[PDB]
Structure formats: structure tokens, C-alpha cells
Amino acid sequence: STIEEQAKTFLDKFNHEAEDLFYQSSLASWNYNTNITEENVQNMNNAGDKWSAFLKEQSTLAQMYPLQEIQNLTVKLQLQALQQNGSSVLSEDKSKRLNTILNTMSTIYSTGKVCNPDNPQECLLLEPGLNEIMANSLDYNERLWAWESWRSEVGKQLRPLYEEYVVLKNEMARANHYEDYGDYWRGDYEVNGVDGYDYSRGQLIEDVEHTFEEIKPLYEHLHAYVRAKLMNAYPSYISPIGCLPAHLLGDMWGRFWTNLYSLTVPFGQKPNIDVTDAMVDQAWDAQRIFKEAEKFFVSVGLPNMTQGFWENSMLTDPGNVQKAVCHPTAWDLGKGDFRILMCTKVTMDDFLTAHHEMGHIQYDMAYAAQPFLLRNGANEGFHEAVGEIMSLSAATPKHLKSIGLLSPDFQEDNETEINFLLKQALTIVGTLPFTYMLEKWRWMVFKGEIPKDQWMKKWWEMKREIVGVVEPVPHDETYCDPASLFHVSNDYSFIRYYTRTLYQFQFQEALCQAAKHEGPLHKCDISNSTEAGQKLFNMLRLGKSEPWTLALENVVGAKNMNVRPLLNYFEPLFTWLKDQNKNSFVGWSTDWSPYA
Amino acid sequence: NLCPFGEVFNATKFPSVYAWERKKISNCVADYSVLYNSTFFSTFKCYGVSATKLNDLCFSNVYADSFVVKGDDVRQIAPGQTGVIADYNYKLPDDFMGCVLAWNTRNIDATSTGNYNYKYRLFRKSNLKPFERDISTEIYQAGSTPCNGVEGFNCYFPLQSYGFQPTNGVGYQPYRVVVLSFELLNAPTVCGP
Ligand SMILES: *[C@@H]1O[C@H](CO)[C@@H](O[C@@H]2O[C@H](CO)[C@@H](O[C@@H]3O[C@H](CO)[C@@H](O)[C@H](O)[C@@H]3O)[C@H](O)[C@H]2NC(C)=O)[C@H](O)[C@H]1NC(C)=O
Ligand SMILES: *[C@@H]1O[C@H](CO)[C@@H](O[C@@H]2O[C@H](CO)[C@@H](O[C@@H]3O[C@H](CO)[C@@H](O)[C@H](O)[C@@H]3O)[C@H](O)[C@H]2NC(C)=O)[C@H](O)[C@H]1NC(C)=O
Ligand SMILES: *[C@@H]1O[C@H](CO)[C@@H](O[C@@H]2O[C@H](CO)[C@@H](O[C@@H]3O[C@H](CO)[C@@H](O)[C@H](O)[C@@H]3O)[C@H](O)[C@H]2NC(C)=O)[C@H](O)[C@H]1NC(C)=O
Ligand SMILES: *[C@@H]1O[C@H](CO)[C@@H](O[C@@H]2O[C@H](CO)[C@@H](O)[C@H](O)[C@H]2NC(C)=O)[C@H](O)[C@H]1NC(C)=O
Ligand SMILES: *[C@@H]1O[C@H](CO)[C@@H](O[C@@H]2O[C@H](CO)[C@@H](O)[C@H](O)[C@H]2NC(C)=O)[C@H](O)[C@H]1NC(C)=O
Ligand SMILES: *[C@@H]1O[C@H](CO)[C@@H](O)[C@H](O)[C@H]1NC(C)=O
Ligand SMILES: [Cl-]
Ligand SMILES: [Zn+2]
């Protein structure tokens, strides 16, 4: 027998053995996430350990097939995926310690509480207390207290754990023939073997920086506008030429400036397109929300949701007797089992996020016929990009009117368009420098370019210079403010959000051109377009069988990420900001601080 | 003396596809309306002869093969398919003259814990000839190293069980299948007005 044929038969056996084990693990973890009990957590951990043991056995087995002798790209990809030594290349004690510190960081992040000094009986954890403050408070001192308490409490605990985390993860990545853990993470985008579609792990850094350079002017003008508007809100606290104080950005970190809309609305005279009251007055429920999303997806040529989906999903909070995890998730359990876990409220935000999660589910349904190890997005950004184009189409006023949640006599001024685009930008473009700077800091730390004695020094230097954000109080090396974010303290890569943000507007442009759309791109609703549906399905069905560059080319015509779709989406707001900032300073000095 | 098609259709236990079961049907009247006036079946596809005009036809004898397959594999019970079921478990001839019938049996063939009785053959050297049947449980040798009856590296047990549970998608839910083939000889037996 040939080495390739032996590997093919091994992969057949693996797929058929792994479907059932992954399904059992998924059932156990679902029973946990929908019904948090000790029996359920023990069953989840049992099934997960069984799956991990099977995976490590199959890894050591697949390593016995010499990769160099494989001439079939698909079986080569599957073999490499199985051969990843992962954490196993660690000694037993070091692996135990790494899992220990991972769980410890996750625990202190998800459980940390800070108490009010003025009223020591009131104590809040991050959700919902401190986030409610950072979202709605207009008091400078209260916001500063929340920000500094969160950091000086949980990040100080996280600091040494994160140092040990860095050293252990670097040991693992180096033992797995990578430069560092950042190189490992960037490996998700690597394509190696297909002529004309390859992609190295440093090409990602090159491309991200080259595109952020072009993003810079739009962000600078949005920053200047928001800075002036915040000066009206916090007089004597903000310099007209300085960076924005980090605790006034709308959430705990400034990842999204969404909650600054009340303070930055261009034309507050216009009514806001918040259809929450319409949904409540029409007696909508989560059933109706998800049925409407399903009708949307069917209107473009995609299948219904499965009866198994409608029978097994949990779309509302089960109440006080049965406590569950409410983070919205789209579950692809395998064996054709698709579910959504979401504690849906009757709000416009939950309507849009239901569209997003059902887009996730549609992707999963579309690549179900692929072999097991190929049932996944082209890269880490594709699922969120698909969900986001769904949510954009659902958020357009044309769609909102056609569904009947917005009045037919809602006039679309040239000012309502700037309002809508500004609110979109606060979220979408406000997050890009944040994401890029966080991942740059993480990459540099993993690379060993930032010594431990100036972690926070370089963190806030980069904050100032890149993001235009300045800390309200000085922080020494005791703090670990990057780890005060969920993705950092829970070992999730972050550049996925940048890449998906660019991908989503590439996709929106392509699918709206397919839908013969004519007006400004942000006014595009791909509803009722079987052509756009087909063009998107041609990419969804591939899963991870083809390179992500080829998958992106199949829909948008380009082998790489592009920023002009995003810039063209935001062009009208860009010119409006350039006019609005004629007598305002654009840019920022990196040296001014709210303290001296 | 009517032919007991009910014995194979309304049967309590159904066999695994790798060990599909064949029942001969000789001289008897055969009402086929008992089959065609019914929406119970999910497929009900006929080949080589009209699906409903069988009543006025007479055959030398009729063979009823029965088994159980996953919903997505029913597509393979037809002439000229090339999947795992069609190649290693149950192959139909290119000149097949008969009818395939299948119906969803999640309620009886799936349990919450998981029904792993129904199996199928995953590995075999050479395909099956039409209507052939293999029950061998000998260790499949993939590589050049001999297996010596022990399962191991490049030595795979050839059978794999379906995992039938009520939360599986329709494509992974169990369907019971009866293939009715019609034999023709220059001999006389199965009419059925
Ligand atoms: C690398 O190896 C894979 C095998 O895993 C090759 O893909 C396989 O190609 C065969 C023949 O093209 C496919 O069989 C086809 O099945 C359909 C089912 O309806 C049938 O209609 C066709 O007549 C044919 O028999 C098989 O499905 C396919 N497997 C997968 C998973 O796609 C692949 O072509 C090899 N790569 C290269 C570059 O040769
Ligand atoms: C494109 O997709 C939209 C999204 O649903 C579809 O629009 C809506 O379709 C429904 C039924 O097809 C229309 O309902 C009817 O509304 C009239 C006017 O109030 C009412 O008197 C009738 O009793 C009925 O309920 C709804 O008006 C319509 N909305 C709009 C804005 O057109 C539309 O059908 C799709 N177009 C296609 C598929 O060509
Ligand atoms: C397996 O068992 C079911 C019932 O347990 C059988 O279905 C039954 O078939 C009979 C006769 O085909 C049906 O009775 C009546 O027949 C007269 C004949 O004139 C007809 O006019 C009536 O409309 C009705 O069909 C009976 O209703 C039907 N019952 C059910 C629940 O479908 C079935 O035939 C058995 N399988 C085999 C292969 O025999
Ligand atoms: C939530 O989880 C529990 C177990 O973690 C489920 O089962 C309950 O507890 C034992 C477990 O066998 C049974 O004897 C009880 O009868 C079950 N019910 C209750 C009320 O205790 C429980 O069914 C799960 N909840 C739901 C809605 O499925
Ligand atoms: C998706 O499902 C809907 C209903 O769930 C299907 O709508 C059918 O519409 C008319 C009446 O509303 C009838 O043909 C049926 O009663 C409806 N179906 C059902 C299951 O009740 C719709 O056809 C489905 N579309 C796709 C593509 O599957
Ligand atoms: C995985 O680890 C083993 C040591 O247990 C080593 O021999 C093997 O080469 C490693 N695999 C890779 C791809 O480096
Ligand atoms: Cl921070
Ligand atoms: Zn998600």
C-alpha cells in the first residue's frame, strides 16, 4: 500500500470514530451550559477528557505517517491538523501547571468584585455592575473609580499568573517548531503548498500594518470629533489636543465607543431608529425574532432551520429554578445537530445578534458534508464576518421598514444617514486601533521584545501613540491592564476581529454588487437576492478544505484582505467629519496626561 | 394464500446493512396497493417497471431484502451509486428491476443513551458484486505489516456502528429499508390481482 492510501484509510477510520465522541462531548457540555449542576459539570469534564485522550492517541498515531510522502493536499491538511503536538510537548508537571494557571486566570476574571469605598456594602463584579457604570455614568470620578478598581484589583492578581502563562506558552510554541506563541496564533492564517495562494505568518503582520496605515485618517477624524464632543461633556478634564482619557470611552476598556452616541450624536433632533418599543408593542418574543431571521435566510435561497434546531435550542432564560450560561453561542454539535444558546430579550440588539448567530449556524450547515477536520471556517474571521453581513442587512432601515418594525413614513434625510453612519463607526472603526494595538503588544511580549520591567510602560506608550488614548492614573509594573480584558485573560487571539471587520465589508460589497444594489453601500439589504445567497454559499460550503485566500477570492475576487470596501462604506461620514473638524485639531500629542 | 409482506415490513427487529436479510417470496397473490396507498414511506422509488402498474403483472418470484441505514445513505440504495454502503454493504445491479422503500424510524431505532446495534462495513478490498453479502469480521489489513488478528496500526476492525440518538439531524437518523426485487425465469407464480 502507498503512504497516501494508508493515511486515507487512517483518516476514514478517524472521521467515523471521532463523529460520535465529539457528539457525546457536545451533548455533555450542552447539558452543562443549559443547566449548571455538579452532575452536569462532571459529565462535561468526563466527556471532554475522553475526547482529549482520543485526540492525543490519534495525534501520536498520525505522526507515524511521513508527511513528506503525501501528494494529496486535503489529506495533507488533515494529517497536519491531527499531528499538531499542541500542549502535549510539555512535561507532565508543566502541563498541569499551565492548565492550572489558565483556569485560575479565567476564574479571577469571571469572579472578581470591587467594592465601593464610600459604601463598603455595595460591591460589583464586572457584569453587570461595573459595565453598567462604564456604559451609562456621566460622572468623571465614578467612571475613574470603576476603571481603576477593576484594574488594580483583578489585573494585579493576574500579573504573575500572566508572566508564567507567557513563559509556558512560549515553551510550548517553541517546542512545536514555532518562533513564539504569537507565531503559533498567526499560524492560523498560513497557507503552504498551493502556488499563487500561499501566505506566511509574517505576511499577516505586514498586511495588518499596511492596512491600518490606510485606516489611520478616518480614525483620526472620528477621534477629533469625539474628543470635542466629550470636551462638552467633561469640561476642564480633556485637552483639545491630547489623547482621550481611557475611562470615558463607553465601556471598561474602550473596545467599542458605542455608548458615546448620546454624547456624540450629530443630529439629536432626528428620532433614533430604535425599534425596541415597536417590538414590545407588537408582542414579539424570541420565537418571533428567530422565525423572522429564518425567513430572512430562506429569502436568499438558504435552507430553513432544522426541526432539531427548533426542538433543541434554548432561546430564552429558563428562569430561577434552572440557571444557564447566557453568552450567545451557535452550536454545531455534529451528526446534523445544530442549536443556538441565547437568553434573548425583546430588543433590536438581540434581533441583530440573532441574525448574526443564525448566520453562524448557516455556515455550519453549509459545510456539514465536509470531512470532520474540515468542518470549520476558512480562517478565524469568517464566521463573524458572515454574521456581521447578516446583521448589517437586518439593520438597514429598508429591511426594518419591510419587516414592519419601523414606520413607513420615516424620512431618510441626509442627516439620518450621517447619524446612522456615525453610530456604526463608533463601534466598527472605533475598535480597529484598539484591536491592532492589543495584538501588537501581545505579539511583542511573546516575541520577547518588551521586557517584564516595562510591560505596562510599553502598553501605555502604544495606547497613546496608536490608539490616541491616555490612562487617567499612572500604572507601574504591578498592574496588568491588558489581562483585564476577557480575551487576554482567557487565552483567545484578538486579531480575528480586525481581519473579520475587513472581510465583512469585502463580503458586503461583493454580495450587494451581486444583488444589483445601486445606492450607498450602507443602504444595502441583500434580502430576496438568490444570486447573493448563491455567491455566499459557494464559499460557505468549502469549510477549511480550500485555502482562505482562495475562499475569499471565490466571493470578492481578491486573494487578500482589502480596506477600500470599509473606507467606501464610511466615505460620507468621512467627508462630514473632515468638514466638522475644520477648526479642530486632528491628531494627538502622546505626552499630555490627566495627571501631573 | 396472500404473501406476507407484512412479515418484512411490520417486522419487530431489522438487520444491519452489512448483514442485510433476504426473504424469498414464491407462489402467492400479491396486493401492492397495501403499499402504494400510503404516505408512510420517505422515498419509495421504483426502477425498470412502473411503480403502480405492478398489480396486473406476474413474476416468477419476489425477493425482499431488508436492512437499516442512516438517512444520508439512503441515496446509495439505487443502481450505479458509489458510496461506502453501496460499495461495501449492499450493491444493486445496473439492470435492477424492483423498488426501494425506506421510512424514518427514529422513534423505535434511536434511544436517548444511543443505539449502537446497527452497524456497517467501512473497509474492504474490492467492491461487492450486485446482491453480494459479507459478514466477515476479519481484521482489515491496510499497510504491509500483517495484522495477525490483533487490531492496531494499519489494522482496522472493518465494522463501524451507527450512533442513533433522537437529537441527530435527519441526515443522521435511522431509516428502515426494504428492497423488492422481481425475478424472471422461463419457468411459471406471483401474480396478485
Ligand atoms: C485527494 O483524495 C480525495 C479522497 O479522499 C479525492 O477526493 C475524492 O475523489 C473521488 C473521485 O473524484 C470522489 O468520488 C466521487 O464520489 C461521488 C459521490 O456522488 C461520485 O458521484 C463520483 O462519481 C466519484 O465517485 C470522492 O467523493 C472524493 N472525496 C472527497 C472527500 O471529496 C481527491 O480528488 C484527491 N485530490 C486530488 C488532487 O486528486
Ligand atoms: C422581499 O422581502 C420582503 C420582506 O418580507 C417581502 O416584503 C413583505 O412581504 C409580505 C408578504 O409577501 C407583504 O405583506 C403584505 O403587506 C400588505 C401591505 O401592508 C398587506 O396589506 C397584506 O395583507 C400582506 O400582509 C409585505 O407588505 C411586504 N413588505 C414590503 C415592504 O414589500 C417581499 O414580499 C419580498 N419580495 C419578493 C420576495 O419579491
Ligand atoms: C403494517 O400494519 C399496518 C397497520 O397496523 C397495515 O396498514 C393497514 O392496511 C390495511 C389494508 O391495506 C388498511 O385497511 C383498509 O383497507 C381498505 C381496503 O379496501 C381500504 O379501503 C381502507 O382505506 C384501509 O386502507 C389499514 O387502514 C392500514 N392501517 C394503517 C394504520 O395504515 C400495513 O398494511 C401493514 N404492512 C404491510 C406490509 O402489510
Ligand atoms: C437539570 O439537571 C438535573 C441533573 O443535573 C436533571 O435531572 C434532575 O436530577 C436528577 C438527576 O437524575 C433526577 O432524579 C431528577 O428527577 C431531575 N429533575 C429534578 C427537578 O431534579 C434535570 O432534569 C435538569 N433539568 C432539565 C429541565 O432537564
Ligand atoms: C420553511 O418552513 C416553512 C414553515 O416552517 C415552510 O412554509 C410552508 O408554507 C406553507 C404555509 O405556510 C405550506 O406549504 C406549509 O404548511 C409550510 N411548511 C410547514 C412545514 O408547515 C417553507 O416552505 C419552508 N421552506 C424551505 C425552503 O424549507
Ligand atoms: C511530538 O512530540 C514527540 C515527542 O513526544 C516528538 O518525537 C515529535 O517529533 C513531535 N512532533 C512534531 C511534529 O514535532
Ligand atoms: Cl487597559
Ligand atoms: Zn460568537
Side-chain angles (χ1 to χ4, degrees), chain A, chain B residues 1-12 14-193:
Chain A
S1 305
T2 321
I3 305 96
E4 219 194 60
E5 308 278 60
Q6 292 171 25
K8 277 189 205 203
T9 59
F10 173 79
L11 282 178
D12 292 343
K13 176 76 184 171
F14 168 83
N15 296 332
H16 288 101
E17 270 285 316
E19 188 99 56
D20 181 62
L21 287 189
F22 183 84
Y23 193 72
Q24 300 311 302
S25 179
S26 303
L27 288 179
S29 73
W30 174 273
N31 286 320
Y32 172 78
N33 279 261
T34 59
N35 187 14
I36 307 176
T37 67
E38 198 63 28
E39 309 176 32
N40 291 339
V41 70
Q42 287 199 214
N43 281 318
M44 174 186 69
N45 288 333
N46 280 258
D49 295 338
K50 193 177 179 196
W51 168 252
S52 307
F54 169 76
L55 218 106
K56 179 51 50 193
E57 180 187 38
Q58 295 301 313
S59 170
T60 58
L61 247 157
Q63 283 161 200
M64 294 201 283
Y65 297 96
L67 225 309
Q68 303 82 38
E69 238 130 349
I70 280 78
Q71 302 135 346
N72 186 314
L73 301 178
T74 297
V75 334
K76 186 157 186 171
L77 248 174
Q78 301 182 69
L79 261 184
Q80 184 173 266
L82 262 184
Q83 285 182 5
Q84 291 174 357
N85 256 332
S87 179
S88 63
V89 76
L90 262 54
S91 65
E92 202 182 22
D93 285 357
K94 281 185 178 176
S95 186
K96 186 66 186 70
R97 181 61 191 169
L98 179 48
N99 294 18
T100 296
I101 60 185
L102 282 176
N103 272 268
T104 304
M105 295 195 310
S106 180
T107 301
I108 50 191
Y109 181 88
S110 61
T111 213
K113 266 189 176 181
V114 302
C115 299
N116 185 11
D118 295 352
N119 188 24
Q121 64 189 3
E122 172 192 350
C123 307
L124 315 171
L125 54 153
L126 177 64
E127 178 65 19
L130 292 181
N131 275 129
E132 207 275 337
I133 295 184
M134 298 306 297
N136 306 315
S137 176
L138 289 167
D139 188 76
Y140 184 96
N141 280 17
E142 184 178 48
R143 298 183 64 91
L144 166 61
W145 168 82
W147 189 95
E148 174 65 8
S149 298
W150 179 248
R151 280 162 183 76
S152 76
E153 296 265 349
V154 308
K156 288 195 183 188
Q157 298 182 39
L158 285 158
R159 186 51 144 83
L161 303 176
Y162 202 80
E163 308 187 293
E164 193 164 12
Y165 158 88
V166 168
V167 52
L168 285 172
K169 283 291 191 180
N170 279 343
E171 273 187 62
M172 176 237 116
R174 294 180 220 281
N176 283 135
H177 299 84
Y178 283 99
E179 298 179 41
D180 45 76
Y181 198 28
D183 202 27
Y184 189 71
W185 276 355
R186 299 192 293 275
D188 180 78
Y189 296 91
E190 181 180 352
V191 176
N192 213 336
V194 187
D195 297 6
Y197 295 103
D198 283 347
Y199 201 95
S200 83
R201 299 182 278 266
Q203 192 72 25
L204 182 75
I205 307 174
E206 178 178 330
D207 291 349
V208 167
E209 298 177 341
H210 176 273
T211 59
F212 183 72
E213 279 297 310
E214 301 197 57
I215 302 180
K216 267 190 179 299
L218 171 65
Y219 176 73
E220 278 178 31
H221 279 288
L222 181 73
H223 179 273
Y225 174 77
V226 170
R227 173 214 275 146
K229 282 280 181 165
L230 288 184
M231 284 181 71
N232 295 330
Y234 306 96
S236 293
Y237 278 110
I238 301 172
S239 160
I241 67 167
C243 292
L244 298 180
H247 68 299
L248 309 170
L249 293 182
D251 61 49
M252 183 50 76
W253 316 269
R255 182 184 173 196
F256 304 107
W257 302 355
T258 302
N259 302 324
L260 302 181
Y261 183 66
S262 57
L263 293 168
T264 60
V265 47
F267 305 94
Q269 214 76 354
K270 301 293 171 184
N272 196 4
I273 315 176
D274 196 320
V275 294
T276 293
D277 278 301
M279 295 171 60
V280 173
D281 290 339
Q282 294 181 18
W284 282 35
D285 53 11
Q287 262 288 319
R288 178 80 162 278
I289 292 170
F290 282 89
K291 236 77 177 70
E292 216 74 47
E294 183 190 40
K295 185 186 302 175
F296 166 82
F297 285 108
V298 174
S299 84
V300 304
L302 288 178
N304 269 327
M305 298 285 93
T306 70
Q307 286 172 351
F309 168 87
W310 285 115
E311 287 163 24
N312 300 327
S313 295
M314 198 189 89
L315 304 183
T316 62
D317 199 328
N320 193 11
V321 306
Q322 180 181 337
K323 296 312 289 86
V325 176
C326 280
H327 194 83
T329 43
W331 291 59
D332 172 14
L333 295 86
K335 290 188 175 189
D337 192 357
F338 302 99
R339 308 182 199 195
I340 284 181
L341 181 43
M342 181 171 173
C343 301
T344 308
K345 314 300 175 182
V346 189
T347 58
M348 180 182 181
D349 286 322
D350 279 7
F351 177 81
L352 299 185
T353 53
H355 277 71
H356 181 109
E357 298 295 340
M358 191 168 294
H360 277 245
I361 288 296
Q362 287 278 350
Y363 204 172
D364 296 338
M365 290 177 54
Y367 61 57
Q370 297 281 353
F372 187 84
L373 317 96
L374 267 40
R375 298 205 197 104
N376 215 327
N379 66 32
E380 53 184 9
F382 271 63
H383 271 78
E384 294 227 340
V386 172
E388 275 307 283
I389 56 188
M390 302 329 174
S391 56
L392 281 27
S393 288
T396 58
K398 180 174 53 182
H399 188 79
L400 291 173
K401 289 172 76 164
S402 81
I403 288 308
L405 293 175
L406 186 60
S407 181
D409 48 60
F410 183 95
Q411 308 290 334
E412 288 175 74
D413 298 304
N414 53 334
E415 301 183 354
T416 57
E417 297 316 298
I418 259 67
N419 274 2
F420 181 77
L421 286 171
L422 187 274
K423 184 172 177 294
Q424 291 287 355
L426 288 172
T427 301
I428 304 181
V429 351
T431 200
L432 299 180
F434 179 92
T435 302
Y436 166 61
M437 186 269 330
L438 172 48
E439 273 287 31
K440 189 81 175 77
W441 181 91
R442 273 174 139 183
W443 285 344
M444 288 177 134
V445 168
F446 295 147
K447 197 172 174 66
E449 290 179 346
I450 303 176
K452 297 160 49 183
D453 61 357
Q454 43 191 354
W455 268 8
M456 300 309 304
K457 175 186 185 183
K458 209 63 169 187
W459 172 260
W460 283 107
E461 284 184 5
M462 292 173 64
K463 273 287 196 186
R464 297 163 134 110
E465 184 177 82
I466 305 176
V467 200
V469 172
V470 57
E471 71 272 34
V473 299
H475 283 173
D476 58 358
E477 301 308 318
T478 291
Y479 295 82
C480 189
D481 303 336
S484 78
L485 184 55
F486 168 81
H487 300 68
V488 177
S489 61
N490 280 261
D491 197 17
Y492 284 103
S493 82
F494 212 67
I495 203 69
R496 69 218 299 163
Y497 299 109
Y498 184 89
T499 61
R500 85 98 212 261
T501 297
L502 270 73
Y503 293 156
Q504 84 189 48
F505 290 99
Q506 264 159 306
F507 291 154
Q508 176 77 340
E509 172 174 292
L511 299 184
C512 295
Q513 291 189 9
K516 306 292 185 174
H517 184 64
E518 194 172 331
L521 185 57
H522 73 275
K523 299 181 87 163
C524 167
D525 175 20
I526 66 160
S527 295
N528 292 337
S529 185
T530 62
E531 287 84 3
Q534 182 81 317
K535 193 174 192 190
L536 187 58
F537 182 86
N538 282 7
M539 182 268 290
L540 288 8
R541 59 178 274 94
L542 295 1
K544 204 190 166 182
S545 74
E546 304 283 10
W548 71 265
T549 58
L550 185 148
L552 174 65
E553 181 187 82
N554 280 9
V555 47
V556 316
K559 299 178 183 172
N560 204 342
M561 68 190 322
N562 197 5
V563 236
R564 207 169 70 177
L566 175 59
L567 296 184
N568 291 2
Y569 183 100
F570 281 109
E571 193 74 43
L573 182 76
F574 184 55
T575 60
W576 187 84
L577 286 15
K578 275 190 294 189
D579 189 292
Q580 271 285 330
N581 295 335
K582 56 175 175 304
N583 304 325
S584 297
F585 185 75
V586 191
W588 54 84
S589 80
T590 64
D591 307 327
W592 173 89
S593 320
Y595 55 91
Chain B
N1 297 323
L2 196 283
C3 328
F5 294 108
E7 281 184 355
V8 302
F9 277 81
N10 287 331
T12 293
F14 253 57
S16 290
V17 58
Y18 86 85
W20 56 278
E21 259 273 333
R22 185 175 196 92
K23 174 151 176 51
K24 184 185 182 182
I25 308 292
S26 290
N27 195 343
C28 55
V29 282
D31 182 15
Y32 297 114
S33 70
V34 72
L35 252 19
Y36 86 67
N37 326 246
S38 164
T39 332
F40 195 62
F41 301 96
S42 311
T43 58
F44 206 152
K45 195 71 208 66
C46 290
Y47 310 87
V49 74
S50 332
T52 308
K53 305 179 178 181
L54 289 177
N55 260 8
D56 53 48
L57 276 173
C58 304
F59 296 102
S60 49
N61 33 23
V62 179
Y63 296 94
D65 316 303
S66 74
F67 50 84
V68 163
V69 203
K70 137 175 82 172
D72 274 337
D73 293 336
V74 172
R75 127 247 190 186
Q76 296 183 26
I77 312 302
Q81 304 307 306
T82 180
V84 160
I85 299 299
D87 287 338
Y88 297 165
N89 298 263
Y90 187 84
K91 188 70 176 70
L92 280 181
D94 302 22
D95 58 314
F96 175 68
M97 187 195 309
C99 300
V100 292
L101 291 78
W103 62 98
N104 181 281
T105 55
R106 189 234 288 186
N107 48 324
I108 74 173
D109 285 338
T111 167
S112 176
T113 125
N115 184 12
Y116 299 88
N117 285 334
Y118 297 108
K119 302 181 183 65
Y120 60 92
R121 157 163 288 100
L122 183 56
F123 301 119
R124 188 170 192 265
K125 11 179 177 178
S126 76
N127 305 319
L128 289 169
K129 281 294 183 173
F131 296 126
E132 205 179 327
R133 180 168 172 269
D134 190 354
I135 333 163
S136 173
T137 63
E138 229 78 20
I139 308 300
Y140 179 86
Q141 176 177 325
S144 54
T145 63
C147 295
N148 298 330
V150 179
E151 158 196 45
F153 175 65
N154 281 334
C155 291
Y156 310 112
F157 194 73
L159 298 187
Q160 201 66 42
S161 49
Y162 286 126
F164 291 135
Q165 286 171 296
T167 49
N168 300 147
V170 170
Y172 281 83
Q173 283 171 46
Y175 280 70
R176 291 191 175 194
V177 177
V178 181
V179 183
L180 296 170
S181 359
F182 308 133
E183 183 169 293
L184 299 173
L185 308 184
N186 290 338
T189 71
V190 188
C191 281

